[PDB]
Short mmCIF file of C-alpha atoms in Angstrom, two decimals:
data_model
loop_
_atom_site.label_atom_id
_atom_site.label_comp_id
_atom_site.label_asym_id
_atom_site.label_seq_id
_atom_site.Cartn_x
_atom_site.Cartn_y
_atom_site.Cartn_z
CA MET A 905 23.82 44.12 42.78
CA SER A 906 20.38 42.45 42.41
CA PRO A 907 20.19 39.66 39.63
CA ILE A 908 21.12 36.41 41.03
CA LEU A 909 22.72 33.62 38.82
CA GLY A 910 22.73 30.83 41.45
CA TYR A 911 23.43 27.72 39.32
CA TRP A 912 26.29 26.14 40.91
CA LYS A 913 30.12 26.18 41.35
CA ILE A 914 30.86 24.19 38.33
CA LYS A 915 32.15 25.82 34.96
CA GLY A 916 30.65 24.40 31.82
CA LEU A 917 26.83 24.60 31.89
CA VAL A 918 26.33 28.33 33.00
CA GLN A 919 30.01 29.61 32.48
CA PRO A 920 29.05 31.11 29.07
CA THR A 921 26.48 33.36 30.87
CA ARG A 922 29.03 34.27 33.42
CA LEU A 923 31.41 35.12 30.79
CA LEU A 924 28.90 37.35 29.11
CA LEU A 925 28.07 39.04 32.44
CA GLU A 926 31.60 40.57 32.47
CA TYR A 927 31.56 41.90 28.80
CA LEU A 928 28.40 43.90 29.46
CA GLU A 929 29.95 45.44 32.47
CA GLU A 930 27.09 44.02 34.43
CA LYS A 931 26.74 43.75 38.24
CA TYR A 932 24.92 40.81 39.79
CA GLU A 933 24.84 38.43 42.88
CA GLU A 934 24.95 34.80 42.77
CA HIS A 935 25.38 31.81 45.20
CA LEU A 936 27.84 29.10 44.09
CA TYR A 937 26.44 25.95 45.69
CA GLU A 938 29.26 23.63 46.68
CA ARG A 939 29.92 19.70 46.35
CA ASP A 940 28.26 18.27 49.51
CA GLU A 941 27.05 21.96 50.25
CA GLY A 942 24.51 20.84 47.61
CA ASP A 943 22.36 19.74 50.65
CA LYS A 944 21.64 23.45 50.69
CA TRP A 945 20.08 22.99 47.18
CA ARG A 946 17.15 20.66 47.69
CA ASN A 947 16.22 22.79 50.64
CA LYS A 948 16.21 26.17 48.89
CA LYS A 949 15.04 25.01 45.49
CA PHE A 950 11.36 26.30 46.49
CA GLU A 951 11.45 29.25 48.88
CA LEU A 952 12.73 31.42 45.79
CA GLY A 953 9.57 31.43 43.64
CA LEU A 954 11.61 29.83 40.93
CA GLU A 955 9.67 29.50 37.71
CA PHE A 956 9.83 25.77 36.91
CA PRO A 957 12.44 24.59 39.59
CA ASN A 958 15.92 24.01 38.36
CA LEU A 959 19.64 24.92 38.16
CA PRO A 960 20.88 27.28 36.77
CA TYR A 961 18.22 29.81 37.90
CA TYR A 962 17.91 33.46 37.54
CA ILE A 963 16.11 36.16 39.54
CA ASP A 964 16.35 39.84 38.89
CA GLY A 965 13.50 40.49 41.03
CA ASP A 966 11.21 41.45 38.22
CA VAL A 967 11.37 37.82 37.04
CA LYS A 968 12.68 34.41 38.31
CA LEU A 969 13.59 32.62 35.15
CA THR A 970 15.04 29.12 34.76
CA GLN A 971 17.04 27.19 32.20
CA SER A 972 20.53 28.26 31.11
CA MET A 973 19.87 28.95 27.26
CA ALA A 974 17.21 31.70 28.33
CA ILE A 975 18.75 33.35 31.38
CA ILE A 976 21.69 34.26 29.12
CA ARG A 977 19.38 35.12 26.53
CA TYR A 978 17.14 37.52 28.60
CA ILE A 979 20.42 38.89 30.15
CA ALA A 980 21.55 39.56 26.68
CA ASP A 981 18.41 40.86 25.14
CA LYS A 982 18.39 43.78 27.63
CA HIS A 983 21.39 44.99 25.57
CA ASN A 984 19.51 44.49 22.50
CA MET A 985 21.81 41.58 21.27
CA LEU A 986 19.36 38.73 20.33
CA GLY A 987 18.25 39.59 17.02
CA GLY A 988 17.57 42.54 14.46
CA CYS A 989 15.22 41.26 12.17
CA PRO A 990 13.22 37.80 11.71
CA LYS A 991 16.10 36.42 9.85
CA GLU A 992 18.67 37.94 12.27
CA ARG A 993 18.24 36.41 15.54
CA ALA A 994 17.47 33.01 13.87
CA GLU A 995 21.22 33.32 13.07
CA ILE A 996 22.27 33.89 16.57
CA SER A 997 19.78 31.17 17.19
CA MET A 998 21.34 28.80 14.57
CA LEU A 999 24.69 29.75 15.97
CA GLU A 1000 23.44 29.18 19.26
CA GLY A 1001 22.05 25.87 18.47
CA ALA A 1002 25.22 25.13 16.42
CA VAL A 1003 27.33 25.70 19.53
CA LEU A 1004 25.57 23.84 22.25
CA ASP A 1005 25.91 20.93 19.51
CA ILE A 1006 29.52 20.67 20.80
CA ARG A 1007 28.96 21.75 24.43
CA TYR A 1008 26.27 19.47 25.08
CA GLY A 1009 27.56 16.67 23.15
CA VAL A 1010 30.40 17.05 25.42
CA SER A 1011 28.47 17.15 28.81
CA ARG A 1012 26.30 14.14 27.65
CA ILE A 1013 29.12 11.51 28.04
CA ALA A 1014 31.13 13.25 30.78
CA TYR A 1015 29.00 11.86 33.59
CA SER A 1016 29.05 8.05 32.94
CA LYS A 1017 32.09 5.96 33.69
CA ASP A 1018 31.36 4.43 30.15
CA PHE A 1019 33.05 7.51 28.77
CA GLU A 1020 36.90 7.06 27.65
CA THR A 1021 35.70 5.10 24.66
CA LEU A 1022 32.87 7.68 24.22
CA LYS A 1023 35.05 10.65 23.71
CA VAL A 1024 36.72 8.23 21.29
CA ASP A 1025 33.46 8.46 19.10
CA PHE A 1026 32.88 12.33 19.07
CA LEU A 1027 36.59 13.64 19.51
CA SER A 1028 36.82 11.91 16.07
CA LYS A 1029 33.47 13.10 14.67
CA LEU A 1030 33.34 16.67 15.94
CA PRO A 1031 36.33 18.01 13.79
CA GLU A 1032 33.54 18.45 11.38
CA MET A 1033 31.70 20.81 13.43
CA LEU A 1034 34.65 22.79 14.62
CA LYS A 1035 34.93 23.41 10.98
CA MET A 1036 31.74 25.34 10.64
CA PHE A 1037 32.67 28.57 12.61
CA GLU A 1038 36.08 28.16 11.03
CA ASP A 1039 34.82 29.53 7.76
CA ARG A 1040 31.98 31.44 9.59
CA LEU A 1041 34.78 33.60 11.02
CA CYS A 1042 36.38 34.73 7.94
CA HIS A 1043 35.42 38.27 6.82
CA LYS A 1044 33.86 38.84 10.29
CA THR A 1045 36.27 39.05 13.09
CA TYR A 1046 33.86 37.62 15.48
CA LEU A 1047 30.83 35.21 14.98
CA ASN A 1048 28.48 37.75 13.77
CA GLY A 1049 30.56 40.69 12.61
CA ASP A 1050 32.38 42.97 14.96
CA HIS A 1051 30.11 43.60 17.92
CA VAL A 1052 30.25 40.28 19.77
CA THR A 1053 27.26 37.91 20.29
CA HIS A 1054 26.55 35.54 23.18
CA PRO A 1055 27.32 32.58 21.10
CA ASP A 1056 30.86 34.13 21.04
CA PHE A 1057 30.89 33.39 24.68
CA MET A 1058 29.21 30.01 24.56
CA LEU A 1059 31.55 28.92 21.64
CA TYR A 1060 34.71 30.06 23.49
CA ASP A 1061 33.66 28.04 26.32
CA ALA A 1062 32.89 25.14 24.00
CA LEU A 1063 36.59 24.92 22.86
CA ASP A 1064 37.88 24.89 26.48
CA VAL A 1065 35.88 21.82 27.58
CA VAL A 1066 36.96 19.94 24.44
CA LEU A 1067 40.45 21.30 24.53
CA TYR A 1068 40.91 19.96 27.82
CA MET A 1069 39.92 16.68 26.32
CA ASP A 1070 42.25 17.29 23.47
CA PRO A 1071 44.95 20.09 23.06
CA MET A 1072 45.93 18.86 19.71
CA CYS A 1073 42.34 19.45 18.36
CA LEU A 1074 42.35 23.41 18.19
CA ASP A 1075 45.53 22.97 15.78
CA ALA A 1076 43.95 22.07 12.31
CA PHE A 1077 41.94 25.32 12.61
CA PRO A 1078 44.10 28.46 13.33
CA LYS A 1079 41.10 30.67 12.95
CA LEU A 1080 39.65 29.46 16.09
CA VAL A 1081 42.94 29.55 17.88
CA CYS A 1082 43.05 33.32 17.19
CA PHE A 1083 39.17 33.81 18.09
CA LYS A 1084 39.31 31.65 21.17
CA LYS A 1085 42.05 33.90 22.09
CA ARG A 1086 40.51 37.22 20.60
CA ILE A 1087 37.84 36.65 23.21
CA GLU A 1088 40.02 36.41 26.34
CA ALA A 1089 41.54 39.54 24.64
CA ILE A 1090 38.99 42.12 25.77
CA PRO A 1091 39.91 43.62 29.00
CA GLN A 1092 36.38 42.93 30.26
CA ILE A 1093 37.04 39.08 29.92
CA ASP A 1094 40.90 39.58 30.14
CA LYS A 1095 40.72 40.63 33.80
CA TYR A 1096 37.82 38.24 34.61
CA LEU A 1097 39.99 35.02 34.12
CA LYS A 1098 42.66 36.53 36.35
CA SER A 1099 40.05 37.54 38.80
CA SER A 1100 39.05 36.06 42.13
CA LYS A 1101 35.70 34.98 40.54
CA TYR A 1102 36.88 32.74 37.58
CA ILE A 1103 36.11 29.18 38.27
CA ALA A 1104 38.21 26.40 36.43
CA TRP A 1105 37.76 22.89 36.99
CA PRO A 1106 35.29 21.26 37.10
CA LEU A 1107 34.24 21.27 33.48
CA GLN A 1108 31.39 18.73 33.86
CA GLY A 1109 29.58 18.13 37.23
CA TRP A 1110 31.61 16.74 40.02
CA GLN A 1111 33.54 13.44 39.60
CA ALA A 1112 31.48 12.62 36.35
CA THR A 1113 34.31 11.06 34.21
CA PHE A 1114 36.15 14.16 32.73
CA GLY A 1115 34.24 16.37 34.89
CA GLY A 1116 36.34 15.65 38.09
CA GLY A 1117 37.02 18.46 40.29
CA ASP A 1118 39.26 20.60 42.67
CA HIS A 1119 38.82 24.19 41.23
CA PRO A 1120 41.61 26.31 40.20
CA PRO A 1121 43.95 23.39 40.21
CA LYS A 1122 47.22 21.91 39.19
CA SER A 1123 48.64 19.41 41.76
CA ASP A 1124 49.99 16.58 39.63
CA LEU A 1125 53.12 16.87 37.45
CA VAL A 1126 52.77 19.91 35.20
CA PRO A 1127 54.19 20.35 31.56
CA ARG A 1128 57.91 21.36 32.19
CA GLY A 1129 60.03 20.46 35.24
CA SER A 1130 63.75 21.43 34.99
CA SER A 1131 64.14 22.73 38.67
CA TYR A 1132 67.61 22.82 39.33
CA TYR A 1133 68.71 19.96 36.94
CA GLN A 1134 70.08 22.52 34.56
CA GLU A 1135 68.78 26.08 34.90
CA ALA A 1136 69.58 27.65 31.50
CA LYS A 1137 68.33 27.18 27.91
CA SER A 1138 64.67 26.93 26.80
CA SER A 1139 63.95 30.47 28.24
CA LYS A 1140 63.32 32.96 25.64
CA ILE A 1141 60.93 35.50 27.39
CA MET A 1142 57.41 33.77 27.68
CA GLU A 1143 55.40 36.89 28.74
CA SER A 1144 53.16 34.12 30.10
CA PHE A 1145 53.16 31.59 32.94
CA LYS A 1146 51.80 29.77 29.81
CA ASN A 1147 53.28 30.60 26.39
CA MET A 1148 54.66 27.22 25.57
CA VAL A 1149 55.77 25.64 22.17
CA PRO A 1150 59.33 24.50 23.04
CA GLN A 1151 60.12 20.88 21.83
CA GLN A 1152 63.50 19.40 21.94
CA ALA A 1153 64.92 16.07 20.87
CA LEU A 1154 68.35 14.22 20.96
CA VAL A 1155 66.44 11.23 22.29
CA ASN A 1156 67.77 7.75 23.46
CA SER A 1157 71.35 6.96 24.59
CA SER A 1158 74.27 5.14 22.84
CA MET B 518 5.09 26.51 -1.34
CA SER B 519 8.53 27.78 -0.85
CA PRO B 520 9.92 27.18 2.74
CA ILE B 521 11.51 23.67 2.96
CA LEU B 522 11.65 21.69 6.15
CA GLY B 523 13.90 19.02 5.08
CA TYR B 524 14.87 17.37 8.29
CA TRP B 525 13.80 13.68 7.84
CA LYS B 526 10.82 11.28 8.03
CA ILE B 527 11.28 10.73 11.60
CA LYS B 528 8.52 12.24 14.21
CA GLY B 529 10.22 13.55 17.38
CA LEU B 530 13.09 15.98 16.80
CA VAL B 531 11.25 18.26 14.06
CA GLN B 532 7.63 17.24 14.52
CA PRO B 533 6.97 20.12 17.05
CA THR B 534 7.89 22.48 14.14
CA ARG B 535 5.61 20.60 11.62
CA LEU B 536 2.76 20.76 14.18
CA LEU B 537 3.22 24.53 14.45
CA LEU B 538 3.24 24.67 10.77
CA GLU B 539 -0.38 23.48 10.65
CA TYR B 540 -1.61 26.12 13.46
CA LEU B 541 -0.44 29.02 11.46
CA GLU B 542 -2.25 27.93 8.31
CA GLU B 543 1.28 27.95 6.73
CA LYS B 544 2.28 26.70 3.35
CA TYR B 545 5.50 25.10 2.86
CA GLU B 546 7.57 22.24 1.02
CA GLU B 547 9.82 19.61 2.56
CA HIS B 548 11.68 16.44 1.80
CA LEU B 549 11.17 13.41 4.12
CA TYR B 550 14.39 11.62 3.71
CA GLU B 551 14.15 7.72 4.17
CA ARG B 552 15.83 4.84 5.97
CA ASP B 553 18.50 3.79 3.38
CA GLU B 554 17.21 6.74 1.09
CA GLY B 555 19.50 8.52 3.66
CA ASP B 556 22.25 7.99 1.05
CA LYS B 557 20.49 10.92 -0.56
CA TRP B 558 21.44 12.93 2.36
CA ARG B 559 25.17 13.00 2.54
CA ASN B 560 25.23 13.90 -0.95
CA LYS B 561 22.76 16.76 -0.87
CA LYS B 562 24.10 18.11 2.48
CA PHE B 563 26.06 20.68 0.70
CA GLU B 564 24.67 21.86 -2.74
CA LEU B 565 21.94 23.69 -0.67
CA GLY B 566 24.03 26.49 0.80
CA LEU B 567 22.88 25.28 4.20
CA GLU B 568 24.16 27.54 6.86
CA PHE B 569 26.08 25.01 8.97
CA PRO B 570 25.29 21.66 7.54
CA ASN B 571 22.87 19.76 9.51
CA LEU B 572 19.26 18.00 9.75
CA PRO B 573 16.70 19.49 10.39
CA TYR B 574 17.32 22.40 7.88
CA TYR B 575 15.25 25.26 6.76
CA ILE B 576 15.47 27.36 3.62
CA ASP B 577 12.82 29.88 3.09
CA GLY B 578 14.90 31.35 0.13
CA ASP B 579 15.62 34.54 2.01
CA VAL B 580 17.45 32.27 4.46
CA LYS B 581 18.82 28.64 4.90
CA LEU B 582 18.79 28.20 8.69
CA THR B 583 19.67 25.08 10.45
CA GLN B 584 19.06 23.65 14.01
CA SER B 585 15.56 22.73 15.18
CA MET B 586 15.17 24.89 18.11
CA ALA B 587 15.65 27.96 15.71
CA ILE B 588 13.79 27.12 12.52
CA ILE B 589 10.55 26.65 14.56
CA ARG B 590 11.36 29.86 16.29
CA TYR B 591 12.06 31.92 13.19
CA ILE B 592 8.93 30.29 11.73
CA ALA B 593 7.01 31.32 14.81
CA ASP B 594 8.45 34.78 15.06
CA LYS B 595 7.13 35.96 11.72
CA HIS B 596 3.83 35.45 13.36
CA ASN B 597 5.06 37.53 16.33
CA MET B 598 4.94 34.61 18.73
CA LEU B 599 8.33 34.68 20.32
CA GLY B 600 8.07 37.56 22.85
CA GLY B 601 6.75 40.78 23.87
CA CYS B 602 8.92 42.31 26.42
CA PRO B 603 12.33 41.28 27.73
CA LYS B 604 10.70 39.35 30.42
CA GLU B 605 8.32 37.89 28.03
CA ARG B 606 10.25 35.82 25.43
CA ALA B 607 12.42 34.44 28.32
CA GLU B 608 9.10 32.78 29.55
CA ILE B 609 8.58 31.16 26.20
CA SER B 610 12.23 30.63 26.52
CA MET B 611 12.24 29.04 30.00
CA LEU B 612 9.05 27.12 28.75
CA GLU B 613 10.89 25.96 25.69
CA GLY B 614 14.00 25.04 27.76
CA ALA B 615 11.68 23.57 30.14
CA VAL B 616 10.15 21.23 27.63
CA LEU B 617 13.27 20.12 25.65
CA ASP B 618 14.25 18.98 29.15
CA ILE B 619 11.92 16.07 28.88
CA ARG B 620 12.03 15.59 25.03
CA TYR B 621 15.78 15.66 24.78
CA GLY B 622 16.15 13.63 28.04
CA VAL B 623 14.13 11.07 25.99
CA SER B 624 16.09 11.11 22.85
CA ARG B 625 19.38 10.80 24.74
CA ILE B 626 18.73 7.22 25.85
CA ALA B 627 16.64 6.12 23.01
CA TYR B 628 19.36 5.41 20.53
CA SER B 629 21.75 2.98 22.70
CA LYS B 630 20.94 -0.66 23.31
CA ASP B 631 21.70 0.09 27.03
CA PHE B 632 18.32 1.57 27.16
CA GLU B 633 15.67 -0.57 28.88
CA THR B 634 17.34 0.19 32.41
CA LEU B 635 17.73 3.83 31.45
CA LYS B 636 14.06 4.64 30.96
CA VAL B 637 14.08 3.11 34.30
CA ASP B 638 16.11 6.01 35.62
CA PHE B 639 14.06 8.82 34.14
CA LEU B 640 10.56 7.51 33.90
CA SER B 641 10.92 7.48 37.50
CA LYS B 642 12.55 10.86 37.92
CA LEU B 643 10.50 12.76 35.35
CA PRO B 644 7.12 12.93 37.08
CA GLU B 645 8.72 15.91 38.87
CA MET B 646 9.06 17.79 35.51
CA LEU B 647 5.68 16.58 34.13
CA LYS B 648 4.47 18.39 37.47
CA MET B 649 5.59 21.88 36.50
CA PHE B 650 3.25 22.75 33.57
CA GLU B 651 0.76 21.06 35.43
CA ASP B 652 0.24 23.95 37.73
CA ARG B 653 1.53 26.34 34.82
CA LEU B 654 -1.72 25.20 33.01
CA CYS B 655 -4.17 26.56 35.82
CA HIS B 656 -5.63 29.82 35.22
CA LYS B 657 -4.25 29.96 31.64
CA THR B 658 -6.00 27.38 29.45
CA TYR B 659 -2.80 26.85 27.39
CA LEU B 660 0.97 27.19 28.53
CA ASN B 661 1.02 31.09 28.18
CA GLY B 662 -2.60 32.13 28.25
CA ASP B 663 -5.01 31.79 25.58
CA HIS B 664 -3.33 32.34 22.28
CA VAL B 665 -1.18 29.30 21.77
CA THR B 666 2.68 29.44 22.13
CA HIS B 667 5.20 27.02 20.13
CA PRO B 668 6.11 25.44 23.46
CA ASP B 669 2.45 24.23 23.41
CA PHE B 670 3.41 22.14 20.47
CA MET B 671 6.81 21.03 21.65
CA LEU B 672 5.16 19.80 24.82
CA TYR B 673 2.37 18.12 23.25
CA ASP B 674 5.02 16.17 21.40
CA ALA B 675 6.83 15.72 24.68
CA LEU B 676 4.15 13.65 26.37
CA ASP B 677 3.74 11.55 22.87
CA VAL B 678 7.18 10.19 23.00
CA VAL B 679 7.15 9.29 26.67
CA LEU B 680 3.57 8.30 26.78
CA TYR B 681 4.51 5.71 24.12
CA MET B 682 6.97 4.64 26.81
CA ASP B 683 4.49 4.83 29.54
CA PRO B 684 0.62 5.11 29.12
CA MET B 685 0.14 5.11 33.04
CA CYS B 686 2.21 8.29 33.21
CA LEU B 687 -0.16 10.99 31.91
CA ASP B 688 -2.52 9.82 34.56
CA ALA B 689 -1.53 11.47 37.95
CA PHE B 690 -1.92 14.61 36.03
CA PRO B 691 -5.35 15.34 34.38
CA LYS B 692 -4.51 18.91 33.63
CA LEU B 693 -2.07 17.68 30.97
CA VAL B 694 -4.42 14.97 29.79
CA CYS B 695 -6.86 17.84 28.89
CA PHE B 696 -4.17 20.08 27.40
CA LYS B 697 -2.52 17.31 25.50
CA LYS B 698 -6.08 16.90 24.10
CA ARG B 699 -6.86 20.56 24.06
CA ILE B 700 -4.24 20.76 21.28
CA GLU B 701 -5.38 18.04 18.97
CA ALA B 702 -8.67 19.82 19.52
CA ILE B 703 -8.19 22.86 16.95
CA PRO B 704 -9.26 21.93 13.46
CA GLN B 705 -5.87 22.89 12.42
CA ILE B 706 -4.06 20.23 14.36
CA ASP B 707 -7.17 18.14 14.36
CA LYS B 708 -7.32 17.58 10.49
CA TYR B 709 -3.40 17.19 10.41
CA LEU B 710 -3.36 13.91 12.54
CA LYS B 711 -6.16 12.46 10.34
CA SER B 712 -4.15 13.78 7.26
CA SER B 713 -1.94 12.14 4.65
CA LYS B 714 1.07 14.06 5.99
CA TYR B 715 1.12 13.03 9.60
CA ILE B 716 3.96 10.75 10.57
CA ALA B 717 3.65 8.42 13.51
CA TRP B 718 6.54 5.94 14.52
CA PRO B 719 9.40 6.36 14.64
CA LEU B 720 9.66 8.64 17.72
CA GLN B 721 13.37 8.37 17.94
CA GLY B 722 15.71 7.69 15.00
CA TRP B 723 15.34 4.30 13.32
CA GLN B 724 15.88 1.19 15.30
CA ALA B 725 17.43 2.94 18.19
CA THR B 726 15.97 1.18 21.18
CA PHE B 727 12.49 2.75 21.52
CA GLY B 728 13.04 4.57 18.25
CA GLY B 729 12.17 1.60 15.97
CA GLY B 730 10.25 2.06 12.95
CA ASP B 731 7.54 1.08 10.48
CA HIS B 732 5.63 4.44 10.06
CA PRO B 733 1.69 4.72 10.76
CA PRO B 734 1.89 1.12 12.22
CA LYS B 735 -0.04 -1.42 14.35
CA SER B 736 0.76 -4.91 13.07
CA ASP B 737 1.23 -6.94 16.25
CA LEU B 738 -1.71 -7.83 18.49
CA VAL B 739 -3.56 -4.55 19.50
CA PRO B 740 -5.51 -3.69 22.72
CA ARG B 741 -8.79 -5.66 22.31
CA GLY B 742 -9.55 -8.79 20.22
CA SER B 743 -13.05 -10.30 20.56
CA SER B 744 -13.62 -10.99 16.85
CA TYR B 745 -16.37 -13.51 16.88
CA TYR B 746 -15.49 -15.10 20.23
CA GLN B 747 -18.54 -13.16 21.42
CA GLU B 748 -19.88 -10.10 19.69
CA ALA B 749 -21.94 -8.32 22.20
CA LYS B 750 -21.15 -6.41 25.51
CA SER B 751 -18.30 -3.82 26.02
CA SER B 752 -19.67 -1.62 23.16
CA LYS B 753 -21.35 1.66 24.40
CA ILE B 754 -20.66 4.10 21.46
CA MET B 755 -16.94 4.89 21.19
CA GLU B 756 -17.00 7.82 18.73
CA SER B 757 -13.48 7.02 18.48
CA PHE B 758 -11.41 3.99 16.95
CA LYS B 759 -9.78 4.89 20.30
CA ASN B 760 -11.89 5.88 23.16
CA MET B 761 -10.97 3.04 25.57
CA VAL B 762 -11.36 2.71 29.45
CA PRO B 763 -13.27 -0.53 29.56
CA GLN B 764 -11.76 -3.16 32.18
CA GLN B 765 -13.60 -6.40 33.12
CA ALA B 766 -12.80 -9.03 35.72
CA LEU B 767 -14.18 -12.33 36.81
CA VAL B 768 -10.69 -13.82 36.52
CA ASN B 769 -9.38 -17.38 37.06
CA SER B 770 -11.47 -20.63 37.06
CA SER B 771 -12.76 -23.14 39.65
#
């Protein structure tokens, strides 16, 4: 009810800020520019006294910041979550920098049609960085102890823009499987994803390569069919339109 | 005499931190890994209790940070240069983010041999971002008033990894020409560039595309020849092995 996110309608890029906006129980406004509605952009890029024209952009009134790593920061800081002592914030800084290292490394190849061979250059060179918060998350439930940190919101978004790229990746790391879940566990976030404000696809710009788009989608064939072909078996109370893990064999004929 | 930079021997990437290390009159150690000496790297990446293995890496003892945007930060902060009030640091944050937007946008295409047509996609789409600090730098001598800010060290390095790409670029902006100079003006930096610690080329990794390398170089034909061919004219006290701006005509024969 005052601060304005602006940015766009796309997920990854400013979602980590949005996520963080639910946890703090924060109230704010924001416009979600649209595909060809992005004509509205060029024309409104200046009337808003935007410090250094961009997207994402913030404007809480008493400031019109730009950039994404800072508007989440400043948004955070008001809640004293940036640092404690010189050697404190640098952690949430190193952590920060550590995460964007996956996030950005993902957005850099998802816009050119020369991707498909590129994911095949990081997807098999990133399992090294996924294994850094693995052990970070050990004694400390979260990424910096109990009380969450914004990098806990950037990282959870990380592995959800890379897991859409490879679902088999967050497997050789069960400590992130729990965290990445231990985050959509808090009622604040819990209710947001099932809210009329959560935005799924796209993950990276529109079209892009892995970006693509259609918002809260599905359309094409989904995991399991079955329809009438044989209603029985497989079902053992899911408690989730998700909760998969079946697997069946028999295979081939005679 | 304790803190260790580490990173590498390459300029752009961690130079902005180095620069900032001169201004504060700070004392520190650091290893400058070398080309094929980068074999020393893989093997020493772990014995140093490096929080989240990387390059650049810091280790002042009472901490072994990683990432580059944070080790300069933490290095800065000890001198109370990060922020003042919630809406203060977000500026030096927006500014920060604003600068890496040129710096990174430069390092992203300088490593693939598909560059040459890529610079030709930003070199002609960046003069928009160069014109943001132009007017920022107006009433305020520097980027955030008198007393410098680290983004004043990231930005000066910006236009010196883009000006090596296009010398004709920092021309339609004389306010950055002065700043970019008003920074190598302070004795602290002044003496550093003419020091046995300044590292010129490479700007981006080794080989790369614009990266290349040979350290404090020249080799090939330089601006003006003249030798004996006619010693006279042109010379009007340079006061600098640099200080160019001649231009002569006549052109063609009869």
